[PDB]
Amino acid sequence: QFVLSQPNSVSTNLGSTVKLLCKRSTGNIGSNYVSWYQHHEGRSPTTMIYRDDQRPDGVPDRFSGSIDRSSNSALLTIDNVQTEDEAAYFCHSYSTGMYIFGGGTKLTVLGQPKAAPSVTLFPPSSEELQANKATLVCLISDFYPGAVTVAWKADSSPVKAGVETTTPSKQSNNKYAASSYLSLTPEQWKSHRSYSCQVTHEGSTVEKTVAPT
Amino acid sequence: EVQLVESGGGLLQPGRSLKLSCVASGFTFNNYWMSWIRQAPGKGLEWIASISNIGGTIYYPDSVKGRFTISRDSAQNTLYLQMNSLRSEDTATYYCTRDLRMSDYFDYWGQGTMVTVSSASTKGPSVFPLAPSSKGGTAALGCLVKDYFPEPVTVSWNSGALTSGVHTFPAVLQSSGLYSLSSVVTVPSSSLGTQTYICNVNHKPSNTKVDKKVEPK
């Protein structure tokens, strides 16, 4: 019937205040109850806000729910943000035997300066080439916040197949890391002059290139 | 206090079937509605099924309509999700919830059960060396752990004697159903002529051990 739309990722700082929105595609946000759930990685979700603006026992006072009909959206408000508040938040609503979830918004709690990615690019090993296989390995480390996009190029042209990239993963020093793999045939690799891995981080890209040995 | 403990699940093949279990306790089972929510890896929450407290009304989205069947046993305080004709898409972590129909929200969540659906079977990794490249004065070297199944793989370096600057990357899931990961180490570039770097790959699901020495070029 409708679709709940949240931003993909928002970031703030400690002690500050953030408002997470959940616009509704059609109809009025006030027609049905809105619910907010916090989700941690490897953890069961817990309900944070029920019935538009009710919080269960134990949920901290910082969390609050609201409704704004001017934008037909709902808001989850977090005052005095803590490091523990870095998580994912899903809004929910029900209408005619359907449970509509939002895309969720990954809340980032900025606890350190911004960091540019370290990018290292490995060509296929000689041993791998003799086994009739070829893989490029692009290692991305030491960036904050942890969200990057990767694009590969063969010579100068975009590569549309054979790319597999990991979700960014939190490193030991609370920075994030990711890795990307390009699969080729050995003839593909040797036929082009170069291959390059482009990592976009906060709208600024770092790029490394390798060429057949 | 309310407890929702889920069981079942595991590794399956396309077109096969599974029945998930959620045992309920700490409350009066027959009052509440129940639901199944899943989250596929690297994806948002998705609602799958909702059953009345009497087994009376049952709602399904179109993505799993006619494939899943939700049921409940009053005598055993148990919620079931029969998944049939499974697909690779249905690979997710499945959560059992208690509903409050009066307020349209799930007030209690289970522990979660992981379901994997792939057409792979147990396979050891093909380990290749990642010869060094720069970072100059600091170089990066590693070894590539390709095409294994299932997780996990463990890597140590120089039998655990080498730990400084060792960073083992989380595995990627290939479209072929197999995993690949890399373990890379950063070391002083001076030592390449004198130091031996051997990565010890361990894949207990297939009982495979591979030791590959990483040399310069």
Numbering used by the authors:
A (entry chain L): 1 to 9, 11 to 27, 27A, 27B, 28 to 66, 66A, 66B, 67 to 106, ...
B (entry chain H): 1 to 52, 52A, 53 to 82, 82A, 82B, 82C, 83 to 100, 100A, ...
Lines from the paper:
Pfs48/45 is a cysteine-rich surface protein that plays a critical role in male gamete fertility. Antibodies against Pfs48/45 have been shown to prevent parasite development and transmission. Here, we report the three-dimensional structure of the Pfs48/45 6C domain and delineate the epitope targeted by one of the most potent transmission-blocking mAbs yet described, 85RF45.1. We also provide molecular details for the development of mAb TB31F, a humanized version of rat mAb 85RF45.1 with improved biophysical properties, now undergoing preclinical development.
Next, we investigated whether amino acid changes in the antibody framework regions during humanization impacted the structural disposition of CDRs. Crystal structures of unliganded 85RF45.1 Fab and unliganded TB31F Fab, solved to 3.15 and 1.5 Å resolutions, respectively, revealed a strikingly similar paratope configuration. The all-atom rmsd between the two unliganded variable domains is 0.88 Å, primarily arising from differences in loop conformations within the framework regions. These structures also revealed how the variable region is optimally configured for binding Pfs48/45 even when unliganded (all-atom rmsd 85RF45.1bound/unbound: 1.52 Å; TB31Fbound/unbound: 1.25 Å). Despite this high structural similarity, amino acid changes during humanization resulted in electrostatic surfaces that are considerably different between the 85RF45.1 and TB31F variable regions, indicating the attainment of antibody resurfacing. In unfolding and aggregation experiments, TB31F Fab was found to have gained in thermostability, with a melting temperature (Tm) of 74.8 °C and an aggregation temperature (Tagg) of 73.0 °C, compared to 63.1 and 63.8 °C for 85RF45.1 Fab, respectively. TB31F Fab shows thermostability throughout a wide pH range, whereas 85RF45.1 Fab is more dependent on pH.
